Design an enzyme around this catalytic site. Structure first.
Site, PDB file in Angstrom:
ATOM      1  CB  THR A   1      -6.074   0.529  11.320  1.00 28.57           C
ATOM      2  OG1 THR A   1      -5.612   1.055   9.942  1.00 28.57           O
ATOM      3  CG2 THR A   1      -5.356   1.463  12.363  1.00 28.57           C
TER       4      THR A   1
ATOM      5  NE  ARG B   1      -2.209   1.475   3.914  1.00 28.38           N
ATOM      6  CZ  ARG B   1      -2.535   2.590   4.348  1.00 28.38           C
ATOM      7  NH1 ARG B   1      -3.356   3.553   3.985  1.00 28.38           N
ATOM      8  NH2 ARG B   1      -2.082   2.877   5.686  1.00 28.38           N
TER       9      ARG B   1
ATOM     10  CE  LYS C   1      -8.246   3.335   4.064  1.00 28.88           C
ATOM     11  NZ  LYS C   1      -7.616   4.842   4.214  1.00 28.88           N
TER      12      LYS C   1
END
Ligand code: OXL
Ligand code: OXL
Ligand code: OXL
Ligand code: OXL
Ligand code: MG
Ligand code: MG
Ligand code: MG
Ligand code: MG
Lengths: 464, 464, 464, 464
Positions: free
Chosen positions: A275, A32, A217
């Protein structure tokens, strides 16, 4: 070997010599590039090191471009960085200024006209919390309630407050263009709110004359209310837990995560979980018990892929993080690869055949199942099933190998375009025989054609 | 309101004025006194503040005494505390000395005679790692491999190496005695390895003339190999993930956790999940996304109770930790209270009746299940079922109310000992009517007798 | 239209002009020639009328040769026919004589040496009952207990008494030979007792140079004890309820029937249910409520085929019987074609693919399943599944069309030996298009190859 | 011993000395008095012989009064009895006459005004068939199509034709009155068409000052369209297959039977299956294979009770029929007592507790289930479950023991009314101990109270 895919984020910690290669060798499946940081030269160097490493090792590695989106952030401080302490009054104004410790600007120009008294303000995903006291003209007056550190351009979130901002900013469009010309494989869009947001991304891609898969997202309440519509309009979803846990109560995030993974799987769309999975490995060589648990639980939830952010991008143990993430995934999968049952019942030709092919393969102890595909669509319908059989995609398009790098349990093979079933079989046996785990006699199940054929085939033999 | 129980650890951070009261009011169900730290005066003050808070609020609060066990620790350093850095040689000797930075003692006197070259040494649960180079006479020579901080008496773990040590040390026995006289409700034993370990604890209790439930902490490979035997011999289990993740590979801990919870539930024994659940809240006002996930996942695994250790004992946000833990638990339970199905089929009178009572209650939309019990045994068989119906235990023994404080979904009522079914019903209606959720007409299901009766009863009405 | 097959027995009532044709047109799928009655000329004429009717209507019709077996029967009476009345003494002697009413011979030469006092003797399947009083030298002296009619050569059964007799008599072998040269499609063997009995039939067939499928008739206790072994060694089974209900208690027959049908289905062998299904239609134009129920229940049990014996062979309403049997079958099937679930789980390539093909067909709303087969083996594995989809077999061997006439739900097509998958598809579309209810666009599922391929195909379209 | 109940019909064949006693001793559970035949003296004598036999053997035996209903029948012939032959013209006129072979009357006075050309006329349940050619004034002209025998007053059925007739005729009402005063336990009504028909029966019972359970006989299309409504308004149902197979196509009867039994069981109403179950035993000492199958299949369908009509009322083997019916039932039940699963889920207190009580009993290997009941309602909800445990009803009303005689698996005990749970338990132990196979220590489950209590009790022991 590992079925669940791993996404790593590139940045300062991976720029040193041949660390990108080291990550790929350690198991990175998708890289990413975060357009919230770094310049175009940075991205360009990193992109090339990934292509080189993918080509040099023969591992598929997708490149994923993450667009910043309508992120709201602070402006600039005179001192560069100050400290916001429990007790202080602070102003955040839509008017331009070179902010001081008590007064500072934001990028959101509708702040004053959209903030109201009692609004909470969370900085840097919950490291500092504030409460809005008053809107005076162009300023939003706040009292710090949990103190901590504030730099320039750090991100703030105002839970509840309805934001008006275009899905793609001017920066995004530039960054999208640059990435498309650079040759990335996928694009993620931050702060998605409706299904119509993908159409804006599609307009830009069409203008430039190149499309790739778009990942939504999920980090907004509106996204979760429209979860089904979003999963259908986009090509994949990332549960973006950082902002999701400030835009929503953090206690709700765990169930939202499971709901989104299930929703993705029912529609054969890849899902990534992002995350803070091994957050502590930014500073420490081993993770916490909660972190190990979190990764194991995302695998059991049924996630296609798990992502590392700060753990690889800025931390002190980027390699160990990837290795550690991989061991946990493997430890879980060795025990079982079983995921939550799906409730939808296949009504589409491709879907129906995929179930059937799994059944055959599993009942006959097949060594692998093999799908031919153009876009990957048939392979994704098989991937969501989470079979313990090796799942092997065959395609002519090489970009598809990169796109399938974030799909559960799947390895891809590039082959020349075929014009007979005889061709396909010879092709398969050839491709598979070049690996050591495949020998003459090994039994495989092949799905093919727009897909309408299942073929139980023993490697080498003439069963066609 | 909340069904899953919360265990908090008392120490320095909870010694300030009326913080223990604050914890109880925030939802603490069981208080753990950790005998690895503090003196008897400390424990005594904390014990009394819990009794006062339990009595003053009317919330049940168990007191759990955690015995240190055969913990292996470093001796004393001349400078008090040094720093072990990646590269250095270090000696750990069984001979006594006032250890220096290069040389230091351990409590384990069989170290030299049991350590072998290549053995790993993990300090403070993985903050510093070492490898054994040589055993020279009475010294174990080591090379630091991951560096960090070492104080006096910090705990080391040598994965794999078979330890010979009595289950109860001299310190433990003293501490057990002190706690039993002090009037704790439960006892946990660290580093349990076999079922026979409980018999040693039982000998001490019998000598002193007082028994309580014993909790086996699972933090050793031998414990996991004998998991079933241990769950049967002990009264409860704690998945002690801190040491478990250094005694075993940390990647295996998540499945061991699920296996133990299931094993406990199948045998109607309470299970607690411990250590690092909200680890970051020692320093931060909000947890990580992995931590929230870890707590949510322990609830879904089916844990009776989750525990806070450093988060309440030494950290900066003991109250917020408890509040945050509680919100996550509630968020999960609001959605559903469903746990993994049990595979065992009830063959015991009490078990069979418990299933039946749940079925009746659920199908009739009963407001509550009520069980009478002597030891809590019938209530625990109902608790493991994880019904959404309030589960209400009635007992004459007041210590049983404290013991049931760590059993899922359960509130307890003390009542005078009863000698007719008429009595029981009048008793129930009286006890329940004193609450706001219970009014005349409310339908409840009562299990009673040694248990052999189910009674569907409407509050107030004459239906005995 | 009808899925369950109908077997009819030919004899005197079907010999009048074009009654055989009438039966075929009414739905007869298999014609049984009973070698217990009639001469070779009779059988020969009937055989030819069936071939003509099958060829003239285009309906498949199997010819089944039923061998008498070791049937025990009475000898000859002076008066031709007498009357045995409740009260009388009767002798049945192994010595030859022209029996009178008090004394008569039997074919069983071991009668005296194998009968004992208290043995029951049932004549003509329970129309007359006797009890053995004494064995004097060569005579078995009996008391009639339930009276009725006795002609020459009527069949007697001695429940319990272990019979010693070769599985094939001299008559059988002659009759088998004659039938094989005549060109029948199947052979049934009466009074089968062990799996080894088929090997005797196989020896005769091999001598003559022609094999056909062998059906074990189940009418003996030893057959039911070896049911599994028998179903495996033979090619099909007939539940022969007439003799089964005198060789065994009649109250046990209904469960034996269900057990045998299930056993056949689990092993993909055809099962026929025989005798007295519409017994009263020998004299009456409509059956009894029990008879209608019995036929309906055999369909729901999962029987491939139901058989008429006296109802067509000697009765007054042979045509109506067949029509009535067909209506009941259809009435049941219109509601549902569901049979008892199978418990065995497919482990064989052919089996596994058959399940899969059904799944695909059903989920995709396919108009038909199509199987290519050599011996019918793949088709039978699909037939036992009892899908509501038309099941269509394609074969080069024309005798296979006759053999599949007694397999559930199955129509067969003769085609030349295609030598490419392209060939098969063109072949299928051609064959199927010649019927109304097959049109271009209709979706079918094709199983093919030794079977290793499933192909979802729309009629006409190029999708090979 | 036997769980399924047996209903026998009394008439000429059971009037000889002590045959009624013989039937009761052979297992008759309910005796049907058919008011289509015999005079009041006949019924009266038979009723008393049943009471005597029930009291003398201690077996419960219900007496069921079958009302003729609106049966349509022929009038009277000059010759008494004629013969209707395939080919003849026949008149059936609503005008009165002393009919001759060509011309005859009917009881239905709306025949001419309701019959139309093409209508079928079936006589004596399908022994002779006719077709309507013309309606000329007051006559219905017919052509015989299937010939046979016609006596005076034989019953005809006109399939399809909507009949207008009161549910109770003048004869019925007289017969109902006589039966109610005589003291029968149940009443069956023939040719029921709607739920409102029971209200007419109820009016008559209320006038006379005595109610009993009413059984709807199902033998009309309108009854099957209103099956659910009928099963709810009436207390029980009889599948009356004789007329059902002429009022409807006979091929549909078998599925209607299964549907009605299931519908009864879902609503805890008893269901009886009637007519022609062992039809051939009117002439023969052993039944047909279809008859044995039919009885076995009614047990597996889940019927409370099976009925004999002509087999006991007029035939040559009334006793053997009952014995034979009983053996078949037992043979089936020995294997398994499992019935088709029920789809309704208990929402009523009584229902929910019944399920629970079964669960407990079965899981604890209880020797028996015991229910206390006023009307039998709780017992019937347990009976439909078809548990293998003895089901034992306790009641104060003695008429309830007679009514439960047609409920599956149930024995009843008369006891004095009790006013304490202590009483109930002492009562149970006393009642049960008077049998062998109940001994001290035997475990039973007791349902009691309006029912709201389950009690697991060991016989003798004090555990109340
Ligand atoms: O953007 C993300 O990945 C997040 O917010 O967690
Ligand atoms: O003792 C504990 O709680 C641990 O080690 O995790
Ligand atoms: O041979 C038969 O078919 C029989 O006995 O039922
Ligand atoms: O009434 C009856 O019993 C019948 O019609 O079957
Ligand atoms: Mg984000
Ligand atoms: Mg520990
Ligand atoms: Mg036979
Ligand atoms: Mg009738």
């Amino acid at each position: 070997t590992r079925r669940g895919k791993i996404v790593c984020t590139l940045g300062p910690a991976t720029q040193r010599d041949d660390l990108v290669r080291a990550l790929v060798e350690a198991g990175m499946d998708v890289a990413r590039m975060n357009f919230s940081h770094g310049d175009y030269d940075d991205h360009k160097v990193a992109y090339e090191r990934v292509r080189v490493a993918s080509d040099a090792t023969g591992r598929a590695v997708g490149v994923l471009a993450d667009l910043q989106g309508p992120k709201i952030r602070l402006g600039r401080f005179a001192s560069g960085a100050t400290h916001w302490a429990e007790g202080e009054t602070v102003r955040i104004t839509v008017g331009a200024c070179e902010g001081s410790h008590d007064r500072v600007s934001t990028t959101y120009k509708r702040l004053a006209q959209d903030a109201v008294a009692g609004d909470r303000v969370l900085v840097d995903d919950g490291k500092v919390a504030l409460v809005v006291d008053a809107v005076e003209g162009d300023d939003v007056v706040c009292t710090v309630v949990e103190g901590g550190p504030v730099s320039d351009n750090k991100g703030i979130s105002l839970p509840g407050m309805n934001v008006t901002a275009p899905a793609l900013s001017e920066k995004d469009i530039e960054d999208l263009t640059f990435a498309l010309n650079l040759g990335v494989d996928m694009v993620a869009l931050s702060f998605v709110r409706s299904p119509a947001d993908v159409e804006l991304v599609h307009e830009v891609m069409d203008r430039i004359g190149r499309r790739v898969p778009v990942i939504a997202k999920l980090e907004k309440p509106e996204a979760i209310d429209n979860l089904e519509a979003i999963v259908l309009a986009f090509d994949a979803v990332m549960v973006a837990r950082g902002d999701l846990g400030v835009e929503l109560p953090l206690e709700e995030v765990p169930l939202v995560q499971k709901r989104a993974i299930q929703m993705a799987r029912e529609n054969a769309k890849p899902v990534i979980v992002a995350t803070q999975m091994l957050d502590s490995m930014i500073e420490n060589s081993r993770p916490t018990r909660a972190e190990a648990s979190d990764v194991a639980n995302a695998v059991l939830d049924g996630a296609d892929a798990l992502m590392l952010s700060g753990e690889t991008s800025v931390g002190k143990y980027p390699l160990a993080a990837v290795r550690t993430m991989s061991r946990i995934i493997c430890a879980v999968e060795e025990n079982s690869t079983a995921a939550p049952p799906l409730t939808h019942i296949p009504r589409t030709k491709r879907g129906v055949i995929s179930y059937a092919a799994r059944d055959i393969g599993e009942r006959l102890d097949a060594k692998a199942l093999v799908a031919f595909t153009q876009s990957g669509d048939t392979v994704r319908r098989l991937a969501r099933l989470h079979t313990p059989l090796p799942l092997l995609a065959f395609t002519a398009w090489p970009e598809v190998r990169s796109q399938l790098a974030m799909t559960w349990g799947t390895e891809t093979f590039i082959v020349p375009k075929m014009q007979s079933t005889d061709g396909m079989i010879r092709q398969v046996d050839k491709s598979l025989l070049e690996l050591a785990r495949y020998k003459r006699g090994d039994l495989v199940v092949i799905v093919a054609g727009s897909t309408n054929l299942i073929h139980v085939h023993r490697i080498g033999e003439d069963d066609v």
